[PDB]
């Protein structure tokens, strides 16, 4: 046993990321079979792709509960040359936050790949219409005009029959990943804006309810990847 060996400047020290294990306690240990239980789950990416609800504000909702940051939007009677909804491409916003992907990323450092964007409507089925969609990469101005949106990464959704539709972001990045934390709207993370315009106005027969509702979702795509999980915050305990 006693032999010349190699010490370390920090032998036996404790770092939170110690890689190996220590002495065991006992033998003779037996455990029961879990076979009767359904479907042991192994990885986050398995579940992260399930469509999650977004949390868009309720347009000055006057209830004493005040805001209702909710996945749906109502149909307006009027329209303007500016999107129904727009937002920066940033993981920190509340609509991102409480998604599966948002909750995951909240404890990760950087992100990579793309996400699935799913869309929905709630009005009477006797409705016919269309909507324009445009992803706006980073630029010198947040898109407003419909024509501007047409210049941006854009597509049009037929509300004629299907009251739901899907989209996936394209992964464009000078770096392998992008900073998950919203330290600042900077070239490291921020990636422009989104826009939403109604293509044509209302078309309904009589007796149909008016100003119906529009709903939306979000969830991870196949290519999405995160890096370096990070620690949490318990302030929600309050």
């Amino acid at each position: 046993g006693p032999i010349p060996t190699a010490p370390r400047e920090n032998s036996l020290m404790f770092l939170s990321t110690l890689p190996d294990d220590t002495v065991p306690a006992y033998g003779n240990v037996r455990t029961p079979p879990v076979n009767y239980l359904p479907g042991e789950i192994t990885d986050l990416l398995q579940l992260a792709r399930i469509p999650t609800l977004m949390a868009f504000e309720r347009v000055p909702e006057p209830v004493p509960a005040s805001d209702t940051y909710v996945p749906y939007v109502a149909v307006p009677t009027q329209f303007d040359d500016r999107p129904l909804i727009s937002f920066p491409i940033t993981l920190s916003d509340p609509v991102y936050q409480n998604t599966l992907v948002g909750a995951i990323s909240s404890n990760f450092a950087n992100y990579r790949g793309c996400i699935q964007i799913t869309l929905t409507f709630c009005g009477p089925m006797m409705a016919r219409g269309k909507f324009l969609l445009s992803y706006s990469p980073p630029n010198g101005t947040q898109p407003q005009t419909l024509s501007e949106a047409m210049q941006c990464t854009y597509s049009i959704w037929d509300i004629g029959l299907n009251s739901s539709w899907t989209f996936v972001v394209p992964y464009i990045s000078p770096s392998d990943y992008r900073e998950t934390r919203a330290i600042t709207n900077s070239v490291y993370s921020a990636d422009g804006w989104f826009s939403l315009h109604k293509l044509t106005k209302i078309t309904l027969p009589p007796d149909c309810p008016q100003s119906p509702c529009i709903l939306f979702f979000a969830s991870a795509g196949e290519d999405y990847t995160l890096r370096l999980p990070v620690d949490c915050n318990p302030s929600y305990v309050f």
């Binding site: 220590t22 006992y26 789950i41 192994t42």
Partner: protein, 231 residues
């Protein structure tokens, strides 16, 4: 990396909580409700699971002494914020790695353990005018400080139950059936004590904490995670 591998993900240590250093055979805290005058030794019997707990016994709600003063004794609890904020699943099973963390510098101490649901009884005997708490030897292992030392160890799954429910909706007992309390879902309790006789009980005050790590776990089914207030 493939960080999203859950089995790899959680295999790291983290603090459980502090406890007071022992200097004699102790009175285990009585079952609730407890009344003044029933003097008991709170704050040394270190429960062994990050579930909500109170006074060396489990707990269902979370309440804390946000105020510094009041009537009665202050209990203590334990929550693993990281894992509990990351626990979006239903059932669980794994082993448990743990290591000692002394708060007082330059400490000499001895520690012991007993498993989940294992009842406690020590008493003491006089070795030549010196009481020797029976627990100084017994059924379970012990470890000691090298004038300070990072004692480490691991324990396996032990409960008769097949698995650990992440969050629970059953009823605890046939009478006083506490919902949300799966009793047999931990590893027991430990206790740190000075290697001195009861007569050597000192005026000085000492404290010790511990870190805990999950080993070779298994998880099932989805589960929700906390919402955040938007303010």
């Amino acid at each position: 990396s493939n960080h999203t591998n859950v089995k790899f993900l959680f295999d790291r240590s983290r603090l459980l909580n502090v406890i007071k250093v022992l200097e004699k055979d102790a009175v285990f805290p009585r079952p609730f409700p407890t009344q003044e005058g029933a003097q008991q030794d709170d704050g040394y019997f270190c429960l062994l699971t990050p579930r909500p707990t109170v006074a060396s016994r489990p707990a269902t709600r979370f309440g804390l002494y946000a105020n510094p003063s009041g009537s009665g004794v202050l209990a203590n609890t334990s929550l693993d914020f990281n894992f509990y904020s990351l626990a979006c699943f239903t059932y669980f099973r794994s082993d448990l790695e743990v290591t000692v963390v002394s708060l007082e510098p330059d400490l000499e101490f001895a520690v012991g353990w007993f498993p989940s649901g294992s009842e406690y009884q020590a008493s003491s005997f006089v070795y030549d005018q010196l009481h020797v708490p029976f627990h100084f030897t017994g059924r379970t292992p012990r470890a000691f400080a090298s004038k300070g030392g990072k004692v480490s160890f691991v324990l396996p799954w032990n409960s008769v139950s097949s698995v650990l429910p992440v969050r629970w909706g059953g009823a605890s007992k046939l009478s006083s059936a506490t919902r949300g309390l799966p009793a047999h879902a931990d590893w027991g309790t430990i206790y740190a004590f000075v290697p001195r006789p009861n007569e050597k009980k000192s005026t000085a005050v000492k404290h010790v904490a511990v870190y805990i790590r999950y080993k070779n776990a298994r998880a099932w089914c989805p589960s929700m995670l906390p919402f955040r207030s938007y303010k």
